[PDB]
Design an enzyme around this catalytic site. Structure first.
Site, PDB file in Angstrom:
ATOM      1  N   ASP A 168      -2.093   5.833  12.447  1.00  0.00           N
ATOM      2  CA  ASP A 168      -0.943   5.837  12.835  1.00  0.00           C
ATOM      3  C   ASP A 168      -0.543   6.942  13.853  1.00  0.00           C
ATOM      4  O   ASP A 168      -0.959   8.056  13.553  1.00  0.00           O
ATOM      5  CB  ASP A 168       0.228   5.557  11.908  1.00  0.00           C
ATOM      6  CG  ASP A 168       0.099   4.546  10.826  1.00  0.00           C
ATOM      7  OD1 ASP A 168      -0.993   4.360  10.344  1.00  0.00           O
ATOM      8  OD2 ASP A 168       1.022   3.829  10.876  1.00  0.00           O
TER       9      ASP A 168
ATOM     10  N   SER B 278       6.899  -0.528   6.727  1.00  0.00           N
ATOM     11  CA  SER B 278       6.224  -0.912   5.415  1.00  0.00           C
ATOM     12  C   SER B 278       4.707  -1.357   5.499  1.00  0.00           C
ATOM     13  O   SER B 278       4.791  -2.311   6.405  1.00  0.00           O
ATOM     14  CB  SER B 278       7.387  -1.956   4.816  1.00  0.00           C
ATOM     15  OG  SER B 278       7.276  -1.807   3.443  1.00  0.00           O
ATOM     16  N   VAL B 279       4.050  -1.037   4.669  1.00  0.00           N
ATOM     17  CA  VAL B 279       2.577  -1.415   4.752  1.00  0.00           C
ATOM     18  C   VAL B 279       2.102  -2.044   3.574  1.00  0.00           C
ATOM     19  O   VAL B 279       2.310  -1.542   2.543  1.00  0.00           O
ATOM     20  CB  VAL B 279       1.620  -0.338   5.115  1.00  0.00           C
ATOM     21  CG1 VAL B 279       0.285  -0.731   4.983  1.00  0.00           C
ATOM     22  CG2 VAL B 279       2.034   0.300   6.429  1.00  0.00           C
TER      23      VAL B 279
ATOM     24  N   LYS C 127       1.344  -4.008   8.807  1.00  0.00           N
ATOM     25  CA  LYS C 127       2.476  -3.049   8.782  1.00  0.00           C
ATOM     26  C   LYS C 127       3.740  -3.821   9.605  1.00  0.00           C
ATOM     27  O   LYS C 127       3.669  -4.456  10.440  1.00  0.00           O
ATOM     28  CB  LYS C 127       2.105  -1.773   9.914  1.00  0.00           C
ATOM     29  CG  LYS C 127       3.397  -0.863  10.195  1.00  0.00           C
ATOM     30  CD  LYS C 127       2.756   0.108  11.286  1.00  0.00           C
ATOM     31  CE  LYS C 127       3.290   1.504  10.680  1.00  0.00           C
ATOM     32  NZ  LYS C 127       3.255   2.472  12.050  1.00  0.00           N
TER      33      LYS C 127
ATOM     34  N   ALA D 177       8.367   5.903   6.780  1.00  0.00           N
ATOM     35  CA  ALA D 177       9.148   6.261   7.907  1.00  0.00           C
ATOM     36  C   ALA D 177       8.520   5.330   9.084  1.00  0.00           C
ATOM     37  O   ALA D 177       9.390   4.652   9.865  1.00  0.00           O
ATOM     38  CB  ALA D 177       9.213   7.696   8.110  1.00  0.00           C
ATOM     39  N   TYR D 178       7.302   5.328   9.281  1.00  0.00           N
ATOM     40  CA  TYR D 178       6.560   4.472  10.098  1.00  0.00           C
ATOM     41  C   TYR D 178       6.947   3.101  10.110  1.00  0.00           C
ATOM     42  O   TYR D 178       7.468   2.149  10.920  1.00  0.00           O
ATOM     43  CB  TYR D 178       5.145   4.721  10.347  1.00  0.00           C
ATOM     44  CG  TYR D 178       4.756   4.643   8.781  1.00  0.00           C
ATOM     45  CD1 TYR D 178       4.715   5.709   7.813  1.00  0.00           C
ATOM     46  CD2 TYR D 178       4.249   3.327   8.070  1.00  0.00           C
ATOM     47  CE1 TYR D 178       3.994   5.458   6.468  1.00  0.00           C
ATOM     48  CE2 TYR D 178       3.757   3.460   7.010  1.00  0.00           C
ATOM     49  CZ  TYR D 178       3.533   4.296   6.283  1.00  0.00           C
ATOM     50  OH  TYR D 178       3.251   4.378   4.850  1.00  0.00           O
TER      51      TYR D 178
ATOM     52  N   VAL E 160       0.836  -1.050  -0.041  1.00  0.00           N
ATOM     53  CA  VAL E 160      -0.007   0.048  -0.057  1.00  0.00           C
ATOM     54  C   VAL E 160       0.950   0.937   0.027  1.00  0.00           C
ATOM     55  O   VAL E 160       0.648   2.178  -0.625  1.00  0.00           O
ATOM     56  CB  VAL E 160      -0.987  -0.043   1.381  1.00  0.00           C
ATOM     57  CG1 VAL E 160      -1.950   0.986   1.261  1.00  0.00           C
ATOM     58  CG2 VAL E 160      -1.775  -1.345   1.449  1.00  0.00           C
ATOM     59  N   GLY E 161       1.883   1.116   0.897  1.00  0.00           N
ATOM     60  CA  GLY E 161       2.827   2.165   1.011  1.00  0.00           C
ATOM     61  C   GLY E 161       4.121   1.948   1.486  1.00  0.00           C
ATOM     62  O   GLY E 161       4.283   0.896   2.272  1.00  0.00           O
ATOM     63  N   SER E 162       5.179   2.687   1.355  1.00  0.00           N
ATOM     64  CA  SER E 162       6.524   2.506   2.211  1.00  0.00           C
ATOM     65  C   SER E 162       6.623   3.682   2.728  1.00  0.00           C
ATOM     66  O   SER E 162       6.496   4.908   2.580  1.00  0.00           O
ATOM     67  CB  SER E 162       7.863   2.562   1.263  1.00  0.00           C
ATOM     68  OG  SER E 162       8.299   1.235   1.508  1.00  0.00           O
TER      69      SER E 162
END
Ligand SMILES: CNC(=O)c1cc(-n2ncc3cc(Nc4c(F)cccc4Cl)c(COC)cc32)cs1
Ligand SMILES: CCCCCCCCO[C@@H]1O[C@H](CO)[C@@H](O)[C@H](O)[C@H]1O
Ligand SMILES: CCCCCCCCO[C@@H]1O[C@H](CO)[C@@H](O)[C@H](O)[C@H]1O
Length: 348
Positions: free
Chosen positions: A164, A33-34, A49, A30-31, A26-28
């Site tokens: 988040d 990898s999703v 996540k 700083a929190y 879905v996205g990369s």
């Protein structure tokens, strides 16, 4: 213990129970990898996540534990809830990755703002749900710290969840950030979240970022142009003479009238924006006060706006060895209990 399988997505390795299938990034972040996934056991799409290097340093390790503790405590209709927590590790000695599982929401707030211009009724329902979830978070003595459109997601019914949490204490947009957090005031109110709500509401009403700063100083520049240079009552609370002198040096700016800035908006919505976007955080409306604002008359239910169980964050004050942080996190992984299936999910 489920069987795990490994798989590479966009250059990151994912090890998960076989129940999770069809992983798609879905996205990369700083929190972390999703990846979107389909859960064979529930028939429900999920967001997974993976914690980025959870125990690389004391700071990362404490932050890992903080996030797991936070998310395990959150049980509210408008806040991200944990469906699963796992690690491929069979033992504490092997423990080096943490995966967090939640329900996959249909869309981000940013996608909705791009997709359509929201009706005033839609803005009331979305902001109502943010404040409802926020009332719950603040009731546990938590500041979210990072409310922003990409941390807010809705389903097909426009039911919304806060996602988040901000994990910084003591890449990442500054647009919804309160001015004090940027200025290092160091005793932040829960009202910093309310400032972020006000920025989001403005954007939902107009379709446009309220304060799209290019950098740190620009962000504050744009803020002061809308709310004005600090009043005398606020200047009284600032100890540094140099900081006060610099504000006096700045060309004085009057607070703009919101009615003119948000013209064509519902007057109640504009009144509520005025009570959120106040420079002095002591004077911002609280989440619980905002839910009783006339703008939410259609959705407010004082008996269905629940508060949280007490949240033990005495750990925030601890300085422990990296091995203790890793060990406490592992205990929290081990003890996690999934929520029960919903009634609507079972039949006769
Ligand atoms: C069709 N659907 C879409 O396009 C979208 C779905 C979502 N969506 N849905 C749920 C969700 C949870 C997290 N974080 C997370 C997680 F993945 C797992 C456990 C805990 C947490 Cl906090 C993130 C990452 O936020 C940066 C995005 C998420 C956002 S766009
Ligand atoms: C250079 C102009 C910057 C203006 C920033 C406002 C000054 C905020 O400064 C803050 O003042 C607080 C109260 O005195 C103190 O508690 C904080 O330590 C200090 O950072
Ligand atoms: C003066 C530089 C512009 C930033 C103004 C932000 C003022 C926010 O308000 C301040 O919040 C602090 C907690 O964070 C409180 O301790 C102060 O009492 C309050 O005035």
């Amino acid at each position: 213990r489920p069987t795990f399988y490994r798989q590479e997505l966009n250059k990151t390795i994912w090890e998960v129970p076989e129940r999770y299938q069809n992983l798609s990034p879905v996205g990369s972040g700083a929190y972390g990898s999703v990846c979107a996934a389909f859960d064979t056991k529930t028939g429900h799409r999920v967001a997974v996540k993976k914690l980025s290097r959870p125990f690389q340093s004391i700071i990362h390790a404490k932050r890992t534990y903080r996030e797991l503790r936070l998310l395990k405590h959150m049980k509210h209709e408008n806040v991200i809830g944990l469906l699963d927590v796992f690690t491929p590790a069979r033992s504490l000695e092997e423990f080096n990755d943490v995966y967090l599982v939640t329900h996959l929401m249909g869309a981000d707030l940013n996608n909705i703002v791009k997709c359509q211009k929201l009706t005033d009724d839609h803005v009331q329902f979305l902001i109502y749900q943010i404040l409802r979830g926020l009332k719950y978070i603040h009731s546990a003595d938590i500041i979210h710290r990072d409310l922003k459109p990409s941390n807010l997601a809705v389903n097909e019914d426009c039911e919304l969840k806060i996602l988040d949490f901000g994990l910084a204490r003591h890449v990442a947009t500054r647009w919804y950030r309160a001015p004090e957090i940027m200025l290092n005031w160091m005793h932040y109110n829960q009202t910093v979240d309310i400032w972020s709500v006000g920025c989001i509401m403005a954007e939902l009403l107009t379709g446009r970022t309220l304060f799209p700063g290019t950098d740190h100083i620009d962000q504050l520049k744009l803020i002061l142009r809308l709310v004005g240079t600090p009043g005398a009552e606020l200047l009284k609370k600032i100890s540094s003479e140099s900081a006060r002198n610099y504000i006096q040096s700045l060309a004085q700016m009057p607070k703009m009238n919101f009615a003119n800035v948000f013209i064509g908006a519902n007057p109640l919505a504009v009144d509520l924006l005025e009570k959120m976007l106040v420079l002095d955080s002591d004077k911002r409306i609280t989440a619980a006060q905002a839910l009783a604002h006339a703008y939410f008359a259609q959705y407010h239910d004082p008996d269905d706006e629940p508060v949280a169980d007490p949240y033990d964050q005495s750990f925030e004050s601890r300085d422990l060895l990296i091995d203790e942080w890793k060990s406490l996190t592992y205990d929290e992984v081990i003890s996690f209990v999934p929520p029960p299936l919903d009634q609507e999910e079972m039949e006769s």
